[PDB]
Each structure stands twice: as structure tokens, then as C-alpha cells.
């Protein structure tokens, strides 16, 4: 097994967040099974750390940066680290104006099932609420691949948002807003076919 790698993490956790909102991001496990293993954050607040197993080989991990800071994210598997082991993420104090719970994010394109593989997947991303902040997607499929999603803002806060699937097989895709996951991301998509 020289060859292959067994675990993967992504998301905005990884990389950045807000003191007193969660740092989400995505683990997927194909050789060893997902409570194998194990996380630990080094930085400037005791913040607790929780993965939340979906079943279908990854997870859900998020942790609650209390204070300003870089911290040091450690995902292992078999008491090493795995490739790109620590992540540095820089948490941001709050904004005052910057509200990442009030986005909302929804079409067939985010849908558990109905996707089908070479035909468009579209959704719309809804910000109006949300305040000041920068619009991030992070984006796989279950086998480690980017997926390039087209983003267009309308103009009022508002998104049209595309992907053209390749394969029938699950596409995640995590939406952030001012380096934070949005509620319902990320979402896991079944491209059918
Ligand atoms: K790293």
C-alpha cells in the first residue's frame, strides 16, 4: 500500500474560521474505517474537537476556536499524521457585520439524489442576510477529485452556481461564508446515473 492514500481532509476549518462559530471540515477514509482515527488542536483556546461519522466512509469534524489565532489541526491515522498533517488555520475575531448561519444555499445540484452524471447540477446561494463576507466553495468527489463549480453572483447577493458531474459517485461540496461553514453544508451529493 505504497501506492495509494488511505485518508483525506478538506474544508475551511482547515484553513480559517471565526472565534465563536464552528470550523467545519470533511474527512474521507478509504483504507483503515473512520473511527480509526484520531484529532488534536494545538492553539490559543482548549477548543474541543468532534468527528460525526455519516456512514458511508467520512465525516463531519468540527471544532470551537474561542480565541483569535493559529492553530494547529492533526488528523492521524496510526499515530502519524496524515500527508498534508498539521493544517495551519488562522481564526479571525467575529465581525460584527458578518453573519454565516442566515445564508442559505439550495437547487437539484445540492440534493442527496436526482443528479445525474454529464448533465448540469445547479443551485443558487442566497446571501442577502448573511452581511459582509467572502464567498468560498470547496468541492470533491469520493474519489479525492476537485470539482470546478462555476459561480456567478447576480448582483444581489444572490448565486448561480453550476457543476457538470463526471462520474456516478458521491460529489461533496462545503460552502463558506467569511471562512465559515454554512447550516446544511457541507452537502453530500449522490450523482447517479
Ligand atoms: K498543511
Known amino acids: 500500500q505504497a501506492g495509494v492514500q488511505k485518508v483525506r481532509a478538506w ?47 467520512s465525516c463531519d469534524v468540527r471544532y470551537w476556536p ?45 440534493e442527496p439524489t436526482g443528479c445525474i452524471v454529464d448533465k448540469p447540477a445547479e443551485f443558487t446561494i442566497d446571501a442577502r442576510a448573511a452581511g459582509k463576507g467572502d464567498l468560498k466553495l470547496y468541492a470533491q468527489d469520493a474519489d479525492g477529485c476537485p470539482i470546478d463549480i462555476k459561480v456567478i453572483p447576480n448582483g444581489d447577493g444572490t448565486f448561480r452556481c453550476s457543476y457538470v458531474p463526471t462520474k456516478p459517485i458521491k460529489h461533496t461540496i462545503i460552502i463558506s461564508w467569511g471562512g465559515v461553514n454554512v447550516p446544511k453544508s457541507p452537502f453530500r451529493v449522490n450523482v447517479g446515473e
Open 66 to 110: 474561542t480565541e483569535p489565532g493559529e492553530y494547529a489541526v492533526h488528523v492521524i491515522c496510526d499515530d502519524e499524521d496524515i500527508r498534508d498533517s498539521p493544517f495551519i488555520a488562522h481564526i479571525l475575531p467575529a465581525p460584527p457585520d458578518c453573519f454565516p448561519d442566515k445564508v442559505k444555499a439550495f437547487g437539484p445540484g445540492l
Open 11 to 57: 474544508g475551511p476549518g482547515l484553513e480559517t474560521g471565526q472565534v465563536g462559530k464552528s470550523a467545519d471540515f470533511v474527512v474521507e477514509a478509504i483504507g483503515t474505517e473512520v473511527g480509526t482515527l484520531g484529532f488534536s488542536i494545538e492553539g490559543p483556546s482548549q477548543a474541543k474537537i468532534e468527528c460525526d461519522d455519516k456512514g458511508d466512509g
